Amino acid sequence: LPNIVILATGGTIAGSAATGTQTTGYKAGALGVDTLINAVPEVKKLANVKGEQFSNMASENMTGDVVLKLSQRVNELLARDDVDGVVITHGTDTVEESAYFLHLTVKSDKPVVFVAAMRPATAISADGPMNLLEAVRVAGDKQSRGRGVMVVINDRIGSARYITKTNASTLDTFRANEEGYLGVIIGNRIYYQNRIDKLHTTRSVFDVRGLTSLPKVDILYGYQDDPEYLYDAAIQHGVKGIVYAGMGAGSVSVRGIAGMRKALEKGVVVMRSTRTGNGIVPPDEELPGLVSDSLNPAHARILLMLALTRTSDPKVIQEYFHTY
Amino acid sequence: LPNIVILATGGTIAGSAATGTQTTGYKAGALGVDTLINAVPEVKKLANVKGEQFSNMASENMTGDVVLKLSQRVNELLARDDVDGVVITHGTDTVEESAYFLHLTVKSDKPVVFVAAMRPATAISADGPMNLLEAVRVAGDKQSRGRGVMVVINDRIGSARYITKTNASTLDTFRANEEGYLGVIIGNRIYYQNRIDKLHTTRSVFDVRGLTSLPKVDILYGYQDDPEYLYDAAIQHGVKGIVYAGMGAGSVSVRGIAGMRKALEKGVVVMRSTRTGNGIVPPDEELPGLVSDSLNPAHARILLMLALTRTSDPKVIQEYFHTY
Amino acid sequence: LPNIVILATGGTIAGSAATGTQTTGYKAGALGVDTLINAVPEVKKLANVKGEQFSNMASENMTGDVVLKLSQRVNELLARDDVDGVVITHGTDTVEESAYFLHLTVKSDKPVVFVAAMRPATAISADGPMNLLEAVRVAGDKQSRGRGVMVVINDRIGSARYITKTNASTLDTFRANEEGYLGVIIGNRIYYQNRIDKLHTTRSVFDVRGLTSLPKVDILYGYQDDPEYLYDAAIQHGVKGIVYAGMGAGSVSVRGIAGMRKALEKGVVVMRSTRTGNGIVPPDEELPGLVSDSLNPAHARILLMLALTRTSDPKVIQEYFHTY
Amino acid sequence: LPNIVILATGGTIAGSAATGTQTTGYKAGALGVDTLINAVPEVKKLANVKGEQFSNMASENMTGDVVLKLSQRVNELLARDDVDGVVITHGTDTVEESAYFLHLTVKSDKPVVFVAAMRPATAISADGPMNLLEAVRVAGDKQSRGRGVMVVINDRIGSARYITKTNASTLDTFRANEEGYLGVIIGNRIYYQNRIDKLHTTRSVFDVRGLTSLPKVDILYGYQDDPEYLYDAAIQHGVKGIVYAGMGAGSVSVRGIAGMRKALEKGVVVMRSTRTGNGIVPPDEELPGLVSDSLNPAHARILLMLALTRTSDPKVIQEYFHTY
Ligand SMILES: *[C@](*)(CO)CC[C@H](N)C(=O)O
Ligand SMILES: *[C@](*)(CO)CC[C@H](N)C(=O)O
Ligand SMILES: *[C@](*)(CO)CC[C@H](N)C(=O)O
Ligand SMILES: *[C@](*)(CO)CC[C@H](N)C(=O)O
């Protein structure tokens, strides 16, 4: 059987509540990895699993420095001959962030599968058990290699570069409206549909094994009456980059333009993304800053942080955004 | 023929570029209302149209004080016996904000139909002509009365309370994933599907007659490493409310919590929404602030501003968010 | 507490397999209603539940004669003062057909909620328990009255007229792409979003309490090289109506039109629907037969079958399709 | 500039009506290929184009004998040094059938791009011009090679294997809900997202040179009370295969089982697909026939016909369905 390491970080999949009817406001990251494994013994028929407790927190508290350590640990594990793949339990709220980070930094073709759950382990009809089982099946399948980092949940396999939490509270929240899923798992069988046409993992230039932190990047929203002072505040607090979750295709108000101008004069890299949820923010030489291609705000921040560890050249960073 | 006033505010539907191939980075709010009307002569067959130039700007620059004037002007028009409905041309980027504002403040059952276009009027296969014709048809149909403010584009009729721009650059960007459309227009016939189960227009308590300004409300994003200083900044500039485009179901990091506690101490109303794009942010007594129900950040800000013109009582405001 | 009757008919929600990993090819309608109730005792805190075993079969074998009896029993149940609502367990495959039949034939405003499950009761992360809890919650809520027949599953409430199984094997299969959900259930709370703008239940003319059989209506597919002989066969077997799951907007090939014309000449009523999955089949005076509005083939057959119990008048039947 | 041949077959993109408001019931395949090119001269700045009138029909009348000739002509064309790609104008109703057929029979990596329109050329805001321009850009782009046959419309690039017409009459009808788009076209730039993970074109074993017709395959629908006599009829007319657009995951009623057994006894290959619209029909040893993987009925019929040109062995045909 394939040797799979289940690296636990917390989340609802490891969460609990006083009753089985409480599906919200529960405590995330309360249960240990072995408890998750023991809850679904069937996994042992899919692989020889080993649980490792990396952390146990609600993902809203996951930070770049910790995500950095997570990627470095996964790289250490994948370098071992006795490890064929890694399943990472993580809270749903920022899994797209953590997953995309490793998508760009893991130097291996071995499967790296993030798994999550929208209902706590104690809930009636909890989704975590089946999602974990599916994650291990995907991580241990020889056909899962070289596909980039994946996020498995609700019978779907999504690419870390496209998948995002689209709904605040539903089981089927993870979707990539325009890009679809890399594959699906039905009747204990994996059906691979797509291979992402972007750079990742073994073909990524982003290596952070020699770093302990990443350049600071904040996200500012775009909306009617958006304030200039928020740009002032970000600049003053030392951001290296600003991701703009803009109105429409990264459109900017006169106040947003003034704020971006100030940011650029201070050497801050401005990246225009969109608040809409999907789609392409196209180049526009008439507006300040760079454009995020199809990366949403959360994803754009991650790539910009990594881009900044390599260069400050806007043209190079822009190309990264069209290829990663 | 019904008497329909076409109130123009600008946008891509009135946008232009030097060539028919340029569909991005064009000049929004460039053409006059009579030019749009004459571009689609067919509207004159569906109604007695009167064009009125309210403004002509790109919607990223639409501001609350101007939206306020727009609502009062529309209210004024619909009180006239010689006006059966109004069609408001508006840029796509913030039409959901302006539309929901009128949805809550226009005290009339007569149709109020926002219309927009994703391609400039000069573009090959421009969508504005048909969108406008559809809008006029909807505004003039007596079966269109008492449905709340609507947004018409790409053969669909969306409720101001549910519809949102979900894609940065596509023609089919306006969708209400979980709520669907109020109706669709195919083959010059309107097919009404749903009636929104929420308070609006004639049943709304949000009277804004005579007002000239609105309570200041800003939006802060939720993501890994989100900074506390952004909350400090908002408070320092006297916001009356803060809408949080949070991770997942409005989950908050330890930094976000500290920032929210500070805001509450200063009497600022905190409203937790979601950055995901869809869904319910449920009540959670363990977290600070109020919850946005299914309102996304842009819509939540609008309702909060209007709520604050009547009260600062969190319980009353929260009820508004579950009923409007 | 409301008095809710759980009327069981079978399905995967009452399905069972030898292993917890077998989610496909299991035995549907294997467990009794009381076993379902005692398995999710939490329902007892939401209402006073009484189980009744109407049948126990796989929905692919549900027949019109039996659905007729189900409708009649439900009418009997709801006429009682000691019954506040009914939850009907049913297999997912044809629940949209049974649900829409009762949607048209139940003469009561009391809630009628069909519930189902995509994973057998014996599977890991089975969805049936939560779905049932949600269905009872909906059936017993005073706010649920007069909304038409509903289908509850995966935290969603769909109208029988719009909801359809859109995916062969996923938990989130039930959706109404263009019409959205009537409401959702999150955190043990119901959020009603829409009220269907169509005739149903207490406003329907489709009373069939005095019937034991229904007009025969078959469905024929539209595709390249579709054969004329299938129409000849249906006619020869006494069909009173033919529903065409046509290419695009009910478009017809030279062979299909010949088939339809033979059917019309033979006294059969022809209804042109679509195989696409969504949308409007508009009127077309150059094509034979009636058009299905936005009803898909499965729904179209149900309405046509019921229409035929009242009339053979094309114009009357057509108006039914635009109003129900 | 690249050399692109625009091979016209008809459709709404070549449709015409007396007025610009008539977008339904128009005459498809009424305009010549050169008329389409002259209406969008911008294409000539993207490539050296040559129009070729293969046919001018409504796609509901496209037949296998003709599709065979279309595939053979495209192979002939792409074998030429002076042809960099081919754009095929085709009606929307069966473009998914014709496109998937060529996807399996064209032995070249040069771009094969089907294009269509949902509004006639004479319609207000006709989509045909932009759709064609985008199709030409995709067909002439070096990055477009080796991606399988594509269908371009409404700024989206869909794979012939996944794309399908999901709505009867909307501009955004073409979607692959679970698989997404191969790419999108925004601001005159192509953004490639995925590469399908299936066999096609140059790696396909389906050699159809010399063939003038294909094995007969008909499609029968699954629904409550589905008739056994339709299977008898199909058998009587000598079908070599039957694609079942089944209830749910290809579930079969007692009548369907009886009819399938009769067909199997007669040597007919029975393929179980789904009427739902999306998803996997998983293998089930308890049911008759083969399963269609994620192929919908229309796509399944095409692959089954081609499968039968090589073998009647069920095991082999099943593998084709899991790999193409
Ligand atoms: C449960 C749903 O995933 C709550 C998740 C936490 N907020 C987390 O992100 O860990
Ligand atoms: C054209 C697409 O709507 C650009 C719109 C402007 N940004 C606006 O919102 O007015
Ligand atoms: C399990 C998924 O619902 C199988 C359902 C049966 N085919 C049925 O419809 O009862
Ligand atoms: C116009 C929309 O595509 C009508 C299409 C024809 N039915 C066709 O398929 O050619």
PDB file of N, CA and C and ligand atoms in Angstrom, chain C residues 10-13 15 23-29 57-61 90-95 116-120 165 168-169 174, chain D residues 247-249 251-252, ligand 3:
ATOM      1  N   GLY C  10     -39.736   5.035   0.217  1.00  0.00           N
ATOM      2  CA  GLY C  10     -38.537   4.270  -0.119  1.00  0.00           C
ATOM      3  C   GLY C  10     -37.301   5.136  -0.346  1.00  0.00           C
ATOM      4  N   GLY C  11     -36.498   4.776  -1.345  1.00  0.00           N
ATOM      5  CA  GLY C  11     -35.312   5.552  -1.674  1.00  0.00           C
ATOM      6  C   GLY C  11     -34.019   5.269  -0.929  1.00  0.00           C
ATOM      7  N   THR C  12     -32.955   5.936  -1.378  1.00  0.00           N
ATOM      8  CA  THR C  12     -31.625   5.808  -0.794  1.00  0.00           C
ATOM      9  C   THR C  12     -31.589   6.263   0.667  1.00  0.00           C
ATOM     10  N   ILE C  13     -32.473   7.189   1.032  1.00  0.00           N
ATOM     11  CA  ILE C  13     -32.535   7.681   2.406  1.00  0.00           C
ATOM     12  C   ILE C  13     -32.888   6.508   3.322  1.00  0.00           C
ATOM     13  N   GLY C  15     -31.914   3.474   2.210  1.00  0.00           N
ATOM     14  CA  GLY C  15     -31.063   2.493   1.562  1.00  0.00           C
ATOM     15  C   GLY C  15     -30.031   1.875   2.489  1.00  0.00           C
ATOM     16  N   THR C  23     -21.210   3.463  -1.667  1.00  0.00           N
ATOM     17  CA  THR C  23     -22.136   4.578  -1.816  1.00  0.00           C
ATOM     18  C   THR C  23     -22.937   4.462  -3.108  1.00  0.00           C
ATOM     19  N   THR C  24     -22.624   3.439  -3.899  1.00  0.00           N
ATOM     20  CA  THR C  24     -23.309   3.205  -5.162  1.00  0.00           C
ATOM     21  C   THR C  24     -23.751   1.742  -5.277  1.00  0.00           C
ATOM     22  N   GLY C  25     -24.800   1.507  -6.062  1.00  0.00           N
ATOM     23  CA  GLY C  25     -25.299   0.155  -6.259  1.00  0.00           C
ATOM     24  C   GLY C  25     -25.834  -0.530  -5.015  1.00  0.00           C
ATOM     25  N   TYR C  26     -26.343   0.256  -4.075  1.00  0.00           N
ATOM     26  CA  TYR C  26     -26.891  -0.276  -2.832  1.00  0.00           C
ATOM     27  C   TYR C  26     -28.366  -0.639  -3.000  1.00  0.00           C
ATOM     28  N   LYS C  27     -28.975  -1.114  -1.919  1.00  0.00           N
ATOM     29  CA  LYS C  27     -30.384  -1.483  -1.928  1.00  0.00           C
ATOM     30  C   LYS C  27     -31.231  -0.317  -1.432  1.00  0.00           C
ATOM     31  N   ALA C  28     -32.025   0.272  -2.323  1.00  0.00           N
ATOM     32  CA  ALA C  28     -32.891   1.390  -1.949  1.00  0.00           C
ATOM     33  C   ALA C  28     -34.182   0.863  -1.321  1.00  0.00           C
ATOM     34  N   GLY C  29     -34.773   1.649  -0.424  1.00  0.00           N
ATOM     35  CA  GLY C  29     -36.010   1.243   0.226  1.00  0.00           C
ATOM     36  C   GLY C  29     -35.885  -0.072   0.978  1.00  0.00           C
ATOM     37  N   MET C  57     -39.856   1.437  -2.150  1.00  0.00           N
ATOM     38  CA  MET C  57     -39.301   1.060  -3.437  1.00  0.00           C
ATOM     39  C   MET C  57     -38.246   2.050  -3.898  1.00  0.00           C
ATOM     40  N   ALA C  58     -37.542   1.687  -4.964  1.00  0.00           N
ATOM     41  CA  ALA C  58     -36.519   2.554  -5.536  1.00  0.00           C
ATOM     42  C   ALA C  58     -37.357   3.464  -6.436  1.00  0.00           C
ATOM     43  N   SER C  59     -37.116   4.774  -6.392  1.00  0.00           N
ATOM     44  CA  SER C  59     -37.931   5.702  -7.172  1.00  0.00           C
ATOM     45  C   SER C  59     -37.937   5.489  -8.677  1.00  0.00           C
ATOM     46  N   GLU C  60     -36.971   4.742  -9.207  1.00  0.00           N
ATOM     47  CA  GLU C  60     -36.980   4.506 -10.643  1.00  0.00           C
ATOM     48  C   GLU C  60     -38.203   3.651 -10.985  1.00  0.00           C
ATOM     49  N   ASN C  61     -38.785   3.016  -9.970  1.00  0.00           N
ATOM     50  CA  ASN C  61     -39.974   2.193 -10.186  1.00  0.00           C
ATOM     51  C   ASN C  61     -41.270   2.867  -9.758  1.00  0.00           C
ATOM     52  N   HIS C  90     -38.434   9.928  -0.257  1.00  0.00           N
ATOM     53  CA  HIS C  90     -38.572   9.439  -1.622  1.00  0.00           C
ATOM     54  C   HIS C  90     -37.181   9.303  -2.235  1.00  0.00           C
ATOM     55  N   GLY C  91     -37.034   8.397  -3.195  1.00  0.00           N
ATOM     56  CA  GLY C  91     -35.749   8.228  -3.853  1.00  0.00           C
ATOM     57  C   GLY C  91     -35.453   9.463  -4.683  1.00  0.00           C
ATOM     58  N   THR C  92     -34.177   9.803  -4.807  1.00  0.00           N
ATOM     59  CA  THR C  92     -33.786  10.999  -5.546  1.00  0.00           C
ATOM     60  C   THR C  92     -34.056  10.968  -7.041  1.00  0.00           C
ATOM     61  N   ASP C  93     -33.924   9.796  -7.653  1.00  0.00           N
ATOM     62  CA  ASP C  93     -34.077   9.694  -9.102  1.00  0.00           C
ATOM     63  C   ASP C  93     -35.324  10.292  -9.720  1.00  0.00           C
ATOM     64  N   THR C  94     -36.487  10.062  -9.116  1.00  0.00           N
ATOM     65  CA  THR C  94     -37.710  10.620  -9.674  1.00  0.00           C
ATOM     66  C   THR C  94     -38.503  11.465  -8.690  1.00  0.00           C
ATOM     67  N   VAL C  95     -37.842  11.965  -7.648  1.00  0.00           N
ATOM     68  CA  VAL C  95     -38.544  12.790  -6.673  1.00  0.00           C
ATOM     69  C   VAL C  95     -39.064  14.073  -7.336  1.00  0.00           C
ATOM     70  N   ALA C 116     -34.882  13.510   0.649  1.00  0.00           N
ATOM     71  CA  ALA C 116     -34.177  12.385   0.063  1.00  0.00           C
ATOM     72  C   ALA C 116     -32.724  12.405   0.511  1.00  0.00           C
ATOM     73  N   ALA C 117     -31.954  11.428   0.039  1.00  0.00           N
ATOM     74  CA  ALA C 117     -30.540  11.319   0.383  1.00  0.00           C
ATOM     75  C   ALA C 117     -29.775  10.712  -0.782  1.00  0.00           C
ATOM     76  N   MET C 118     -28.551  11.179  -0.995  1.00  0.00           N
ATOM     77  CA  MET C 118     -27.732  10.666  -2.082  1.00  0.00           C
ATOM     78  C   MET C 118     -26.817   9.523  -1.669  1.00  0.00           C
ATOM     79  N   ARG C 119     -26.637   9.345  -0.363  1.00  0.00           N
ATOM     80  CA  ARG C 119     -25.810   8.260   0.169  1.00  0.00           C
ATOM     81  C   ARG C 119     -26.707   7.376   1.044  1.00  0.00           C
ATOM     82  N   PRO C 120     -26.529   6.042   0.978  1.00  0.00           N
ATOM     83  CA  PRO C 120     -27.361   5.155   1.797  1.00  0.00           C
ATOM     84  C   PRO C 120     -27.159   5.409   3.291  1.00  0.00           C
ATOM     85  N   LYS C 165     -32.828  16.956 -10.323  1.00  0.00           N
ATOM     86  CA  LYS C 165     -31.569  16.292  -9.995  1.00  0.00           C
ATOM     87  C   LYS C 165     -30.681  16.597 -11.201  1.00  0.00           C
ATOM     88  N   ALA C 168     -25.730  12.994 -11.620  1.00  0.00           N
ATOM     89  CA  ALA C 168     -25.998  11.599 -11.356  1.00  0.00           C
ATOM     90  C   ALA C 168     -25.644  11.057  -9.969  1.00  0.00           C
ATOM     91  N   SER C 169     -24.603  11.587  -9.335  1.00  0.00           N
ATOM     92  CA  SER C 169     -24.197  11.024  -8.052  1.00  0.00           C
ATOM     93  C   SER C 169     -23.671  11.915  -6.931  1.00  0.00           C
ATOM     94  N   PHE C 174     -29.248  18.389  -6.422  1.00  0.00           N
ATOM     95  CA  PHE C 174     -30.474  19.162  -6.625  1.00  0.00           C
ATOM     96  C   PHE C 174     -30.249  20.658  -6.688  1.00  0.00           C
TER      97      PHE C 174
ATOM     98  N   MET D 247     -32.631   7.807 -15.370  1.00  0.00           N
ATOM     99  CA  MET D 247     -33.014   8.491 -14.156  1.00  0.00           C
ATOM    100  C   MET D 247     -31.791   8.394 -13.250  1.00  0.00           C
ATOM    101  N   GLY D 248     -31.439   9.499 -12.597  1.00  0.00           N
ATOM    102  CA  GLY D 248     -30.298   9.504 -11.700  1.00  0.00           C
ATOM    103  C   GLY D 248     -29.046   8.924 -12.330  1.00  0.00           C
ATOM    104  N   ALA D 249     -28.372   8.046 -11.593  1.00  0.00           N
ATOM    105  CA  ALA D 249     -27.144   7.414 -12.070  1.00  0.00           C
ATOM    106  C   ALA D 249     -27.455   6.223 -12.968  1.00  0.00           C
ATOM    107  N   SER D 251     -30.191   4.656 -13.379  1.00  0.00           N
ATOM    108  CA  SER D 251     -31.055   3.676 -12.732  1.00  0.00           C
ATOM    109  C   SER D 251     -32.105   3.226 -13.735  1.00  0.00           C
ATOM    110  N   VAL D 252     -32.520   1.970 -13.619  1.00  0.00           N
ATOM    111  CA  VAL D 252     -33.488   1.396 -14.543  1.00  0.00           C
ATOM    112  C   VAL D 252     -34.710   0.799 -13.859  1.00  0.00           C
TER     113      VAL D 252
HETATM  114  C1  LIG E   3     -29.396   6.299  -4.111  1.00  0.00           C
HETATM  115  C2  LIG E   3     -29.329   7.795  -4.407  1.00  0.00           C
HETATM  116  O1  LIG E   3     -30.546   8.452  -4.087  1.00  0.00           O
HETATM  117  C3  LIG E   3     -30.185   5.505  -5.157  1.00  0.00           C
HETATM  118  C4  LIG E   3     -31.596   6.030  -5.305  1.00  0.00           C
HETATM  119  C5  LIG E   3     -32.587   5.077  -5.978  1.00  0.00           C
HETATM  120  N1  LIG E   3     -32.198   4.805  -7.362  1.00  0.00           N
HETATM  121  C6  LIG E   3     -33.968   5.710  -5.906  1.00  0.00           C
HETATM  122  O2  LIG E   3     -34.243   6.598  -6.737  1.00  0.00           O
HETATM  123  O3  LIG E   3     -34.744   5.327  -5.007  1.00  0.00           O
END
